[PDB]
Design a protein around this ligand. Structure first.
Ligand SMILES: [Ca+2]
Ligand SMILES: [Ca+2]
Lengths: 585, 585
């Protein structure tokens, strides 16, 4: 077979513990190029003469080019060596080891997992596992306190069309006054973009990390929100921008004054002195030449201790987690220590970085708990919105990413359909609710934490930034209640069905022609099949269904009881209709 | 080409900064599949309408199945986003990026390397970059103080055939007296095995990590050795065990004598009581059924602190490095923190662990500086000793292991030929000095830190443990001064030719027939073509040498002056003769 395509590494996303005594091993190989992959393992210090323990690695799923096999090494010694046995199509065999490939087991070698220390087991907040985050763009959510509105605030209307310099008054107070709504919907957590003291409209150039920006509120009001939120079963998540600071930050303001005389010169990245200039800057900033944003030297202990203090403060205020802004741009050590600090104060405080590329490095279990799933979104966009890729590609894209990181991460990844940095998904769907809906039914049933962008629940609309930041629609006569209900129910099902939150995924059906995709969520003896007919015509399809997994499901959405007849299950989906079948166990 | 063979990642040994503004990148492929590999890159925040820089990745080498390309990226902004351009035999142009492979650059996405932090540039001590260690098993090296000689010691004779529990009285005072010997040899640091107070013949079950064993010496005696060695250009590298303790350790005692009533019960891995018995373990130990070695719970903040205290002390005595056994069976967080500590007391403290399998997760730069290059020994122990493998294979086994880690790690790897655990290399050669020499020659010109086992520099032969620990031959008469002066001259050269210590490695010639392997060490403009003639015959091979690298070389071993013609170099080598050609630059 093709051995230069087979891959595995006794670490990272291919080898990791799930329990102190259980190791997860994965193997990659060319699609179809392999048919049977078994794992022969035994304690590292065991006699070579002894018999190795066998382990079967099922095909966890495949993508555009690879097949993925996954097993589960049961280890009592907490230490284990293991070699693969790969059987191909024609029936040929080969051993895969650290040493290399060989027909003989000996010359194959053997991979090794040093030791499984409980402290290196990827562990995340249990609640986070089954939760629904809701992104709040404060400025445009709800204006509850007029007295704190910035000068020149445009009236709050539905037919308003926002501009980079527009303002509507959105503030914390408002968030509270609306909690009942947020609760009704079922969100269990709120994600707040930057709400710290800042002079700009974007508030990404922090001025005071220890104070809530005026237009939004104050410590008293925040504490209140937190509590009023907490009692209503909603958690708070604050956006931390530790990478760069604002050109007003006390520490940076001094540098701009005392120059090299300030005990803060090495808190930032400066070169040619003195420190100032028009549109030119001798100090490093966020992105390319952004004066109002001096990169913070998170490597310097001082610069670390401050940020950490900032964490402590707000930690005490009662928040439930952090959303790292531009995290991949800050030394890993900072992050490693940040987690530790955050976790000692609150073991359930979630930590979510924002990287726009293979986040594997921060997702080993010692840094962040998860990252925004830009990939999930892209796949979503091109499959339900633009129709650029067909169900087969959609399956591959989805499958490739799942394998990218350890399950622990995989399962926590924040799946958004959009953001303040992108156009509304409805708009992406060219105004077609049907598509929109199906997309939601998928986000709401797929692997990974659901993130709803404020508005989308009642069908708001809008082009790219800042058109995606229109003010929240509050008039019932002007809201999409039918949608709101659709969400409510999906959100509920996600709580009633455990498979959907704590279950794995495995592709069920894919048709590039019919353009229909289906996956299954499995946990213990349960089971939940999701069928999606991504088309504008009525279609019927036959899906493989062995009695071992049951022969009668229930469309949790319509109540229709579908019955299976000899491994097959006939299904007739309406345009852009989605089915959520529950086996019963 | 087989795209499922190509592999790369923006981390580990495939993406790492050699400096704060330079990112080394490595690409893997099927041997032969790729012919040309170029890297297109620009700042992470660069504009798409902007131009892309270029970097020609040259075939850094090639093992049994893969081809490895390498390219150094110059990033001033410290933010790089790149994409590969591969080209196969048929000139097919395919780009490789984070998204995947495509004949369209854009459609191929692009790899990204977040940010280059100076604190994350694998940094090792300068002195270690060109040192030559000398393993000392204090028991059988020099007995300078008989006042410590344990009752039952034997006679120091050339014919002494040690036994599994023999005694020779060797101690530290002997290491001091005999220093003029080492200095002469040319060594630059000594590596001792466990020398901490312990009740055993191997002392791997430490009793007091705070004092020398009674039979070896004491604090005063130790210091004296340190200062004396230091004023001779020799450094001290102690071997400490932090994975487990001895059964007599002050803490474990309390436990084996106060069940769960022990204020140290969480300092070990205990399942139940009674605490112990012969042939019974109620606690975890190194390997299986080894009561003497009770694993330490390095995860415990207290157990960690103590070990650190042990470090601190011995580091204040003036040591310069640590050699850690079973380093892989102790959590990362420990090592990360241990490195940070040590480095704060002495920026030039070397930290080397012992891992008998891929050690990448420990050689990222935040933990160990290097490991014992066991891959090297095996490849050497078969090419010059037994002859199980031919030159081609050799070349491969090297080129492979080499690529395991980043360049800063591969470069400090301790290349041993034998050790206190194996048989002496001469004995692996069946007493054949001819072969041995070449080996030494290679081991002394190849990439990585040369480690010399006590005695092997004068011929000292011997079978596997405990026959590898024969009493050091001190009677000049009964010594192979011929080898001694051979070793010495080699050391001198490696200290004169930058390339040999701080240079990269690339194969020059590898012929399965003649069985002649020749490699080249390089730095800036210097070159050291080393040619190895591994055959009992006087073979003559041709070497490809473009007039760019030079036209005239010099064999530093003999002084002969060879010349290249029209990009061709004819050399006549003798049976097992080593040549070290310097391009005179
Ligand atoms: Ca307001
Ligand atoms: Ca003695």
């Amino acid at each position: 077979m093709l051995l230069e395509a087979i891959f595995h590494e006794a670490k990272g996303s291919y080898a990791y513990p799930i329990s102190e005594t259980q190791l997860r091993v994965r193997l990659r190989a060319k699609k179809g190029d392999v048919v049977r992959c078994e794992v022969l393992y035994a304690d590292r210090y065991a006699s070579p003469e002894e018999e190795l323990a066998h382990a079967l690695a099922g095909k966890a799923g495949s993508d555009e080019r690879f097949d993925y096999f996954e097993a589960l090494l049961e280890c009592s010694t907490k230490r284990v060596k293991y070699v693969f046995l790969l059987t191909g199509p024609q029936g040929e065999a080969v051993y895969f080891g650290e040493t290399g490939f060989s027909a003989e087991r000996s010359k194959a070698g053997v991979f090794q997992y040093a030791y499984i220390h409980r402290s290196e087991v990827f562990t995340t907040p249990e609640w986070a596992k089954e939760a629904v985050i809701y992104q709040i763009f404060p400025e445009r959510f709800a204006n509850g306190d007029p007295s704190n509105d910035p000068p020149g605030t445009e009236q709050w209307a539905k037919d308003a069309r926002p501009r980079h310099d527009s303002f509507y008054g959105g503030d914390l107070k408002g968030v509270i006054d609306r909690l009942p709504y947020l609760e009704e919907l079922g969100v269990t957590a709120l994600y707040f973009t930057p709400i710290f003291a800042s002079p700009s409209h974007h508030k990404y150039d922090t001025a005071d990390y220890l104070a809530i920006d005026p237009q939004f509120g104050d410590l008293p009001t925040f504490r209140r929100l937190v509590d009023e939120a907490h009692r209503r079963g909603i958690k708070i998540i604050l956006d931390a921008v530790f990478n760069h600071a604002g050109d007003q930050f006390f520490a940076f303001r001094d540098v701009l004054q005392k120059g090299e005389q300030s005990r803060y010169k090495d808190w930032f990245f400066i070169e040619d002195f003195p420190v100032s200039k028009t549109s030119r800057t001798n100090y490093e900033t966020f992105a390319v030449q952004v004066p109002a944003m001096p990169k913070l030297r998170t490597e310097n202990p001082e610069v670390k201790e401050y940020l950490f203090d900032v964490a402590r403060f707000w930690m005490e205020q009662g928040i439930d987690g952090w959303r790292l802004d531009v995290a991949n741009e800050v030394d890993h050590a900072f992050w490693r220590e940040f987690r530790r600090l955050v976790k000692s104060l609150n073991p359930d405080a979630l930590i979510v970085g924002e990287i726009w590329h293979d986040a594997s490095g921060w997702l080993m279990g010692d840094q962040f708990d998860s990252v925004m799933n830009y990939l999930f979104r892209e796949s979503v966009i091109r499959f339900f919105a633009t129709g650029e890729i067909h169900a087969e590609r959609f399956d591959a894209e989805l499958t490739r990413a799942r394998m990218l990181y350890p399950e622990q991460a995989a399962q926590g990844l924040w799946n958004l359909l959009d953001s303040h940095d992108t156009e509304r998904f409805l708009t992406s769907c060219g105004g077609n609710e049907a598509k929109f809906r199906l997309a939601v039914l998928f986000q709401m049933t797929y692997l990974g934490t659901p993130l709803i962008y404020y508005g989308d629940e009642i069908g708001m609309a809008g082009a790219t930034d800042p058109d995606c930041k229109r003010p929240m629609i509050w008039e019932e006569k002007e809201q999409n209640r039918g949608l709101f209900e659709f969400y409510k129910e999906l959100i509920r099902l996600r709580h009633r069905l455990a498979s959907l939150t704590r279950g794995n995924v495995r592709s069920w059906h894919a048709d590039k022609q019919a353009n229909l995709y289906a996956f299954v969520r499995t946990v213990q003896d349960q089971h939940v099949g999701v069928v999606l007919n991504n088309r504008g015509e009525k279609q019927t399809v036959l899906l493989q269904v062995p009695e071992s997994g049951g022969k009668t499901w229930l469309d949790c959405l319509t109540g229709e009881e579908v019955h299976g007849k000899q491994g097959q299950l006939k299904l007739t989906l309406r345009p852009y209709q989605g089915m959520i079948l529950w086996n019963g166990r």
